[PDB]
Design a protein around this ligand. Structure first.
Ligand SMILES: NC(=O)C1=CN([C@@H]2O[C@H](COP(=O)(O)OP(=O)(O)OC[C@H]3O[C@@H](n4cnc5c(N)ncnc54)[C@H](OP(=O)(O)O)[C@@H]3O)[C@@H](O)[C@H]2O)C=CC1
Ligand SMILES: NC(=O)C1=CN([C@@H]2O[C@H](COP(=O)(O)OP(=O)(O)OC[C@H]3O[C@@H](n4cnc5c(N)ncnc54)[C@H](OP(=O)(O)O)[C@@H]3O)[C@@H](O)[C@H]2O)C=CC1
Ligand SMILES: O=P(O)(O)OC[C@H]1O[C@@H](O)[C@H](O)[C@@H](O)[C@@H]1O
Lengths: 484, 484, 484, 484
């Protein structure tokens, strides 16, 4: 587009970090290979670490995390030629002046028709340095609006409750416009999450069914086999609710429950997401079951409390089932089950829309229909229903109408961060967390979170690799999800 | 269960015929192999032809049409041991007395506890001899009710209009109870047709959608590659409407449109089928397109009028598209497109429930959802809907949630006549055409049929192997089915 | 019609009784005056009492209960000329032979073209003599079918539970066809009860709303100021459930809950009433509140237990609130509140269809819509809804769209028995309790009734003239009816 | 509440005019009497006319148009004491400086706690002087924001098509904020129009019915007995579409069709009105019938073309029926009939929501339900439905559930301008035409209007006092409104 006619500089701050090498640079590599970045793009790493050999770091460390190298015919050296590194602090104005000048040098070397350059700052940094970096960038590394735009990609956590998150947003207010800020929730870059809006509002079949008349229960599920060992106890102060429920699953919740937007423009969609989240009744201790994993039966995985970085009397939940209510006319009386756990029997992210029983004329010879959207693994959408048992026997059984992407489509689906970085470069804010959207999410869970920190909510043990605490399943059953 | 405790005699009248060897005996073979008939069942062929060698006829002719011989270790000789043949006329009382005595011999040889025997008479005969055979059987070959039941399986045609069919039913009235008569419409034995009732009324998902609020158009389609050559001009006096639309597709129509029945008992289901058929507005010349096939482009297939058994100025349609209206609150304003043709590009039987457009917010970037039930070939049910194009491109495309039986299920689906004969033996009348059900069907088409015979409806040519006359597609389009 | 061309004899058995003079003869008088009976009709009273002066009894006693004498110009003497009286027993065949002969004499005196005569037997008798009278009539007072019809009007009670009622029906089976029996439930002759079917199924507005998607709760209410004093303790063995709930309010229940009938013919309507009643979950002790009235506060009305004809430890309920569930897809989750009491603050029969809350955007500034059908007093139908407060204040209030019959229509509505007798003469069984309809009703309440007789259900006191026991209101509230 | 704590000055520009004396001052009088204005309010008339005696003008002319004088004991002299008059031009800055100073004098004389004063400018002036007056006020008669607000009440016409109206809005843009501008459409002050939003969204009964599943046709009707004589030909350049359809009836249209708003705040409501108007398909010549009134049959009223101020070959329509389509999922396929005419048989403003037929089981013995909202005369809301004919006859008839305000409520409903002026003083913009709302309305009708001016749409004659041209009724019938 017009992205090609003007210089483009992508600055990865914290380029020496975990996210940078595992997600950011690999996503940028894929975007380069698909012709989604300009050939003459400049990617500038920025961090406090001194690089003795930049070429070696790029070839050995960075390139080690690139995927799909062999299948498609894209040269790695050409992409690495676009990457520079630079050393500097995250607080001193002298270093942000140096950063600006390095960008200027790259912008002047741009050979295209138009002058100046567009600047994308990716903040792959810890929350402790966030505000200082935003102040330095705002003060001394902004392009003037006439010569190009500035966009900020920022990562979670965004505070740890309503109050802390609001303070953080207020510090950003005078530094950047909300247009310029792109808050990542990387689940919004996943294929099947991106398809929710199309599934709901492009299809009469689902439009007509998507309310309390037909829907009995909605379940949103997150499972991982991995534990929280080797983090350095970073998880202990966060917990499973702050880590995935407050952001990833609430984002999914909002997409599943919002009204039809006025258009497909970014703000019309985000307006509806905020609108519905403000109608969610805040979670409370009585309508949740918490869990903290213990050592596995086979002995391989040690317990949460055996991690040397966690205090011995920690309430930190690694597992949680919540029952939420959305108080409006579309959703009244429909229980929303949100569950998320680490150290479980499988890796899973799925959405289950369980419809009401058709009581007659089949009674107990049928069961509830269910729309299942599985985002990972093996992404698929399928509709569970009752049919006649094939053949001469005249009986019933449950079956599916299936769409499994790896069988139907001959394409490799990109990592979430490829979609999102691309959309940030296009200037589309649809799949990024707006300031008021973030506030609405924290208000749902903050009362519960504060209760948990005071030690008022019981946390149940479960062996790593198990399905979680037994009373989680009983809680789900009485909540209205008929498991079958 | 009680079928085993009393003798069972299945008499195939017209056993020397086309239907007998191709459908009847092969179906009985499959039922024997699946343990669905008693091991000591007696199958008695009856016709005017003299059999010089019964064993050879059975081994060479009959066994030639048996399928799945290698798949199971079911012995063919054991089944053929149960078959006898007998010569006799279709009108003389002396021969029906002989038939009775032959049955009596078989019944006496039954070794089980109870006395007498149940008798199933399969009338695989032309319509010319039908009433005479019914009179002979009624008069001189009935079991007394105390010693067993008598059931009559009878084949179409059942008259050629409302009047002729009513006369025929009135002749049967004093001979047999309606409970004893099992009128075949063999499409009701096909897997996907049997599944219609379960699909509609066991599933909230389809229950909620099954009315004029969500449905824009319903299309029922019958196609065959075969022509009507070599029949001896039997088709000329019948036509495509009488041959498949009045029976097969109207049966499907009734299942797709009926209200939810009071229970799953046979008469509760048949009541609903009759109820809805009486609400169908009779077809008329203005809302139909007729066709008669001509010679194929490649030259292999000759035209309908080249068959030496058809008169030269025949109006007989080999192709027809009808638009019907069902006048009730569920279906008001929903056009029903019934189409059926021979000498077309493919063999097909499918049902398409085309839903309304979701107008916003996708507009022309989505299209109508469609539930497709394909009964043959390669039986399947799938739901066409719009989804995001997989990958980085953020676009839409039409896809499916699919259930293809040959991929999902590892079972060979039976021929229609296996299911039906089995259900006749069980005494379940659900999938058999009731006397009033038949009358309701004739009333829909009779006014049109009489108009066609008077030469008042234009019949358009189309080359064999083509898709039919061009104005059939235009008629379908303006009728409200959006083809895409 | 053809009612005029053949003799008509209406025999009122138990003509000396309470029902006869208060309801039967007065209804017949009104029918005569409106030209609904033939001028030459014969009305024959039959009972054991000897009449010293028949003319005086007619002029003084019977005519005393006739209404609307002055407003319309109908002569009383002309009607009384059509009435005869006759003495006889209810068991002796000699007396039913005499009855037959008296009818024959009246039939021969008919001067019209056709011979014979139609006979309507009204059994205004106690249950103790019922079967004996039916046997005598069947044996010795039937018209032959060729010379006219015979119809039996019979009154409740029809047994006192499922078993007793079934025995009674089995005794009637060989005596009369179900076509000939017309079981009275006189609430089906009331204007607003007759209008239920039209209200529901002639109007799209109510058709679309009449299910669990829009309806939150349905309440059916019966109140009387009168007590049960002076009955001679007849009520004590019956109770409020048997007296009005099992029949009157269950009839109303069936009309409010049935599916749309296949046509407006009598059996199509009655089929639907039976169908839905068989889907009602039987009442149980936990979901009811019983009451028995005590002396009024002002002292005028004595308590139920002060009636000298009731035993001192009677459990007999004069008040009852029931919560019923109809288990089907139209009604799942919708509580049905049936309440009925004597010795209450007012006389009332009304039906309240309370719809769900529209939650947004008015919240607590609106309240549940409610359709109210009031059958008595001052029969009316009105729809309670929220509107803007009239004038400059921009607020909300609850108001009504009203149809009060005495204001809108300038007509006097007939007593229930005028409609019903007229419909019995026309041969329309729509508003008469069918044998299977009756059985379905008893099955709903019998388990509860037997529990009450064993003394297992608590009966609460309430002062006559009060609104009933306090915990009845609390039971109603938690059941889901929001009173406002 | 805070309106009392600061000075209030209401300036009526064009106070010598028709609107001022007939609507503006009388409305202000009513607001004074109901305690809705502060007792120490200042009302300042402003116009070019010189007033020889201000007290006489107030007492004789102005007070002549006040109503409800006797009904309350509200003193007229007290209100007139609050009115001043002042002479000045509409273009000279010297006069707007004088105006400012006169306001300042009144503000200083305010005795309450706070300083400054709020200023409401009512522009009761012709469109020719509009922009000049807005410029003068903006330049030299604004209160500074710290000392009070400024609000502008402005009257139609707002241009004569999309282009002219857009230019006008662009001239206002730099002079006033959209928050300060209150564009009058006085139909939004009428009781029954104000109640539309409450009727639709506070009631489950109407919420559930308000879409194409239940609604067959919506008709909005405007009729007047008065003609356009004596106006000086002012109407000729405007026509009925610009005069009432583009504004009054389109406002009603938007309220009847909008989605449920996110809240009851002004901008949430106005957003929905704009949203739906942008989905209305523009009117076109084929889907309209135009009329121009001729002399009445009785001779009293002369024709439109006999008015000496109209050119002889005028196409100006005094009557118009339009069929509009709203292209979204709520309204697809539902025809909207807008009709408006002068010189007709009656004065009427009503809204008719005609529902679909309930086809079974009553067929032609029922008819379409209809919700009727009548704003004038004799304001009422009623629901037309089918019921059993009262009494012994068992037939059907159409009746109503009625709410007639003059019978139900003992209150005199205010003129439209009382509500609106009051809401402007409160700062509630809900019932005022927003800039984008206005643009959306012009886009609906502009293509049609330009066609009419070019002389491409036929204009039919009709006698004054008649019901309009005959082919208007035929157009309505084929459009889908069943008149009965
Ligand atoms: N073939 C098929 O797949 C279908 C068949 N049907 C129906 O099933 C029935 C049987 O069909 P099909 O088997 O094709 O019929 P056929 O023409 O093969 O006749 C069946 C048998 O009946 C006897 N028969 C034939 N013509 C006469 C006659 N004029 N008078 C007396 N007997 C005669 C013959 O036996 P014999 O001379 O030895 O007595 C013959 O073997 C028919 O009613 C047909 O309409 C319906 C749909 C499809
Ligand atoms: N009358 C009604 O009910 C309705 C009115 N309206 C709108 O309200 C506004 C006022 O209407 P209305 O009161 O009938 O208007 P008028 O024609 O009565 O004019 C209003 C006042 O403005 C001044 N004026 C009139 N003509 C001119 C001119 N050519 N140049 C400068 N000043 C002039 C006069 O005062 P002076 O000469 O003393 O300065 C006059 O008293 C208009 O915009 C109209 O479209 C809309 C719908 C209905
Ligand atoms: O679709 P199927 O089961 O092969 O049956 C098709 C045949 O069905 C028969 O009933 C018709 O008479 C034939 O004309 C038709 O070809």
């Amino acid at each position: 587009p017009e992205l090609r006619s003007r210089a483009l500089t992508i600055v990865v701050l914290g380029a020496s970090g975990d996210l940078a090498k595992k997600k950011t640079f690999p996503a940028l590599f894929q975007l380069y290979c698909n012709g989604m970045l300009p050939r003459d793009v400049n990617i500038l790493g920025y961090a406090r670490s001194t690089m003795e050999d930049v070429e070696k770091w790029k070839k050995d460390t960075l390139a080690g995390f690139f995927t799909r190298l062999d299948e498609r015919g894209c040269h790695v050296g050409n992409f690495l030629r676009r990457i520079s590194y630079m050393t500097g602090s995250y607080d001193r104005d002298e270093d942000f002046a140096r950063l600006n000048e390095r960008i200027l040098r790259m912008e002047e070397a741009f050979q295209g028709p138009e002058k100046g350059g567009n600047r994308l700052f990716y903040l792959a940094l810890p929350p402790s340095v966030f505000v200082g970096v935003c102040r330095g960038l705002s003060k001394g590394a902004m392009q003037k609006p006439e010569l190009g735009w500035v966009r900020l990609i920022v990562e979670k956590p965004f505070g740890r409750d309503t109050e802390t998150s609001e303070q953080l947003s207020n510090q950003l207010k005078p530094l950047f416009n909300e247009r310029q800020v792109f808050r990542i929730d990387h689940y919004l870059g996943k294929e099947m999450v991106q398809n929710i809006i199309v599934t709901r509002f492009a299809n009469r079949v689902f439009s007509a069914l998507w309310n309390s008349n037909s829907i009995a229960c909605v379940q949103i599920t997150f499972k991982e086999k991995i534990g929280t060992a080797g983090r350095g106890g970073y998880f202990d102060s966060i917990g499973i609710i702050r880590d995935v429920i407050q952001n990833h699953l609430t984002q999914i919740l909002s997409l599943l429950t919002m009204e039809k937007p006025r258009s497909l423009s970014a703000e019309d969609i985000r307006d509806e997401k905020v609108q519905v989240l403000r109608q969610v009744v805040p979670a409370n201790p009585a309508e949740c079951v918490l869990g903290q994993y213990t050592a596995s039966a086979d002995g391989s995985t040690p317990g949460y409390l055996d991690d040397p970085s966690v205090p011995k009397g920690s309430h930190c939940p690694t597992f949680a089932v919540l029952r939420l209510h959305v108080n409006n006319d579309r959703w009244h009386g429909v229980p929303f089950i949100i569950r998320a756990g680490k150290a479980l029997e499988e890796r899973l992210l799925d959405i289950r829309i369980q419809f009401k029983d058709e009581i007659r004329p089949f009674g107990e010879s049928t069961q509830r229909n269910e729309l299942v959207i599985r985002a990972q693994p093996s992404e698929a959408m399928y509709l569970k229903l009752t049919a006649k048992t094939p053949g001469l026997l005249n009986d019933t059984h449950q079956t599916e109408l299936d769409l499994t992407y790896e069988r139907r489509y001959d394409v490799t689906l990109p990592d979430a961060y490829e979609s999102l970085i691309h959309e940030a470069l296009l200037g589309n804010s649809t799949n990024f967390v707006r300031v008021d959207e973030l506030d609405a999410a924290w208000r749902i869970y903050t009362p519960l979170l504060h209760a948990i920190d005071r030690g008022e909510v019981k946390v149940l043990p479960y062996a790593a690799g198990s399905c979680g605490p037994e009373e989680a399943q009983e809680f789900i059953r009485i909540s209205g999800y008929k498991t079958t």
